Amino acid sequence: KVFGRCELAAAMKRHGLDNYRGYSLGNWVCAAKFESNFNTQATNRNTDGSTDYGILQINSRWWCNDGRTPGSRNLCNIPCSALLSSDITASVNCAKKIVSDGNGMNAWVAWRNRCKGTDVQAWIRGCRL
Ligand code: NA
């Protein structure tokens, strides 16, 4: 599913991401935009052989099991395919584990490079939330 910007914001809000560990909703929407262009089916292979999955591009080296990333962990305890669902619950629940891991949203390279220190509230302006 390709979300609309406000549709995604609402979904994320309902799943407890607004201000989760102090990151306002616009941060999450901004990261999704640049990670996946709001497409839950997005996948991208990394140089190390791991793959990033879903709307928030969660990596198989640490967070999910894809059966093809040797020596990896599965810290969210989920098949990576669950992250591609139109239902974002598994991505959100896993993202809450990731953002709590020490480095905050800096875990998402696109957040650090494209969202951090920008007016992220712009991503939810105009939405009914
Ligand atoms: Na893994």
Swiss-Prot record:
Cell compartments where the protein resides: Secreted
Protein name: Lysozyme C
Catalytic activity reported: Hydrolysis of (1->4)-beta-linkages between N-acetylmuramic acid and N-acetyl-D-glucosamine residues in a peptidoglycan and between N-acetyl-D-glucosamine residues in chitodextrins
More about this protein: Lysozyme C is capable of both hydrolysis and transglycosylation; it also shows a slight esterase activity. It acts rapidly on both peptide-substituted and unsubstituted peptidoglycan, and slowly on chitin oligosaccharides.
GO MF terms held by the record: beta-N-acetylglucosaminidase activity; identical protein binding; lysozyme activity
GO biological process terms held by the UniProt record: cell wall macromolecule catabolic process; defense response to bacterium; defense response to Gram-negative bacterium; defense response to Gram-positive bacterium; killing of cells of another organism
Originating species: Gallus gallus
Ligand binding (substrate): D101
Function: Lysozymes have primarily a bacteriolytic function; those in tissues and body fluids are associated with the monocyte-macrophage system and enhance the activity of immunoagents. Has bacteriolytic activity against M.luteus.
Keywords, ordered alphabetically: Allergen, Antimicrobial, Bacteriolytic enzyme, Disulfide bond, Glycosidase, Hydrolase, Secreted, Signal
Family assignment from sequence similarity: Belongs to the glycosyl hydrolase 22 family.
